[PDB]
Amino acid sequence: TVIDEKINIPVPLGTVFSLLYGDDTSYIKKIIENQNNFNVCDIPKFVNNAREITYTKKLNNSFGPKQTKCIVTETIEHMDLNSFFMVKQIVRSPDVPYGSSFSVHTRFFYSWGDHNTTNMKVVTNVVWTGKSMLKGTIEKGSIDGQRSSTKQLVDDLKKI
Ligand SMILES: CC(C)[C@@H](C)/C=C/[C@@H](C)[C@H]1CC[C@H]2C3=CC=C4C[C@@H](O)CC[C@]4(C)[C@H]3CC[C@]12C
């Protein structure tokens, strides 16, 4: 469930918001392009605190499909204008075994830190809409790669 409990971003809350979710989508597009993905759509601005992002993810697993599409729903859930905000991703990947029976939900918690730093926690969980003996492989499939995805995102986020 709890991917990363406390990373610290040496940049203010409002700028981390702008850098990952601002109306200039070029940073997040570079971020997303760096996580083993291709055929990335043109990254939309948020409208009504929601935006859709599509791409194909290359997989190196035991023997999944070894690539799958991803239809990602990204929404800004909570905005306390000074102390914290939170973004929630719902990620569908129809091409994998038992796709359309689940989605991956990841919450990105960003909070005002000391001398106006930003610390983030990342929490995910699979929501199920169908039975599947694969349940516990997908569940730890989601957690495992999300762990990797967060590592690249904070790795690229600090560089700038
Ligand atoms: C045996 C097979 C069927 C197993 C391994 C399939 C695992 C899939 C479902 C996993 C592996 C990589 C995972 C994956 C990696 C990284 C991210 C980035 C994150 O920001 C949203 C979720 C997302 C997109 C997830 C979704 C679920 C994926 C695509």
Curated annotation (Swiss-Prot):
It is found in: Mitochondrion membrane; Endoplasmic reticulum membrane. Residues 1-160 form the VASt domain. The VASt domains bind sterols. Involved in induction of programmed cell death in response to reactive oxygen species (ROS). May be involved in sterol transfer between intracellular membranes. Belongs to the YSP2 family. This is Membrane-anchored lipid-binding protein YSP2.
